[model samples]
Target: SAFANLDAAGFLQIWQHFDADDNGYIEGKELDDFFRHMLKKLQPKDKITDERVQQIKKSFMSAYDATFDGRLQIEELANMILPQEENFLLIFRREAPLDNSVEFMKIWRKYDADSSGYISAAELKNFLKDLFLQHKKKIPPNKLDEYTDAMMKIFDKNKDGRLDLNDLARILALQENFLLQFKMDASSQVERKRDFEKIFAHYDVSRTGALEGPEVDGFVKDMMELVRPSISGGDLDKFRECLLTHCDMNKDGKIQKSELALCLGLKHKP
Candidate 1:
């Protein structure tokens, strides 16, 4: 999961997206995009030659592509791409040339250094911290203080005031088994029960047990990490900005449930 690592706090970020509709169980296209996005990235820029793309397509066959149509859909993505992508080639290159000089092995070995072949939660987090620190971002507090506190309070059983590698590993392990416990409440993560209910309850504003337009907008605002805090603060308004680019429909400056989930995967594909 090194290629997909977001950590407990970070993995929660991914979990947020995975739990589209604010319900759990990453179904439909949501499951597809996670792997498809990686597929697109796996094809390097300079290496995106007609010959190479054709080669990958032939080898991966209909696994990564559905129709021989030369395009990809999220469902098709899940059926084959997600489970088998690791077999082809696994390296994430950034602005590097397509050839061996680009050090693709370095990118892969960096995460696979435990040399276990597959990167786990801790390895992924360590890699991400390196990326985040290199970028030197000072993420504003309100982005998720409430949610973050909730997670730390529940998971930090040692009262260490912070999570160690073992804690992170346990968190990921808990998440891997999450889908199995969906009967409880569509989520395996125990700590999310309270917040998930509170957030969903907020969205169920009409009290008719259905999320309406205003309800969706309000939900977006409440869950928006950058909605109020990031814009006025020093950092970029990522949450708000993403809403504009993605969820915002008809140029109205707000997103409703119908519009937000309108195109399904397109909603949060960014």
Candidate 2:
């Protein structure tokens, strides 16, 4: 009864709501909108206090941790949230779609583009392009050619100019990978977590159990360059913040073997 279980039909319904540009698959901003929607409806009584809202946020956020990385992805909006079928079904049927945006209508129209009440690729793309271009904010003006060319190359999947839901879904998967890599690349600069414990033990100049400033600077800079060929110093600083914030535990500034292990999910460990 908590408005949580999100399945294929539910996801498509919600997905259509967030695919403001009428593309088939939902993306990150769409995921973000769901979180925002959850807030407005559940907390309308108290004017939505930040702390109270975050409690709900964490509840919904758990679904986005698809790889269970304690982080969220757009697809996880539907997939991750589904297992809690009762919760999702409850709110889905009884409440929530109320806050969907005007842009969401374009998504619906695309699905019904023939006006004979069936969707068409042509109508979908016409409107989808309008929505996609608006949300792709950081895309460089000059890179529009590159972006379109790449989408055509990968998404077309058949040399066709129009994108269907299948193409939209495929492109979204590719874009998610690109964004994840980009986020890591964008953040590698100031991050100063200790390397593997073995590495830390090896590099501990005085066994002080902390990374030296030079050690951190060199490692982070090298990481930045390795992940992103020409990242600015600002990007490196943000990356550093993300690194430490995600890994550091125990409310202490220091990281231990367990903390590092948790950060990586210890996949390679026996």
Q: Rate the local accuracy (lDDT) of all candidates.
A: 0.36, 0.40
Model 1 over residues 1-270: C-alpha lDDT tens digits? 123311222222343465555343454434334433333544323334445544544444454342344333333433343332221111111111122211222333455433232344334434444433434433444522432443345445465444432222222222232111121123322333344446657677566533444565455555433222333332324434544453333466554433332212111111
Q: Write the per-residue lDDT of candidate 2 for residues 1-270, one digit (tens) a residue.
A: 244333333344445456656443554434445555555543344465556544654665444342243333334454455553323332332322222222332453345332222234445444445445434323344444454454454445564444533233222312122112322122231232233334445544676644434554554565446444666777655444544454433445454333233222121121
Model 1 scores worst on lDDT over the 10 consecutive residues at 87-96
Candidate 1 regions with alpha-carbon error over 4 angstroms: 1-200, 203-221, 224-236, 258-270
lDDT of candidate 2 at residue 80, scale 0 to 100: 50
Q: List candidate 2 stretches off by more than 4 Å.
A: 1-203, 212-214, 257-270
Best by lDDT: 2
Against the true structure, candidate 2 reaches a TM-score of: 0.26
How much is 2 displaced in model 1, in angstroms? 14
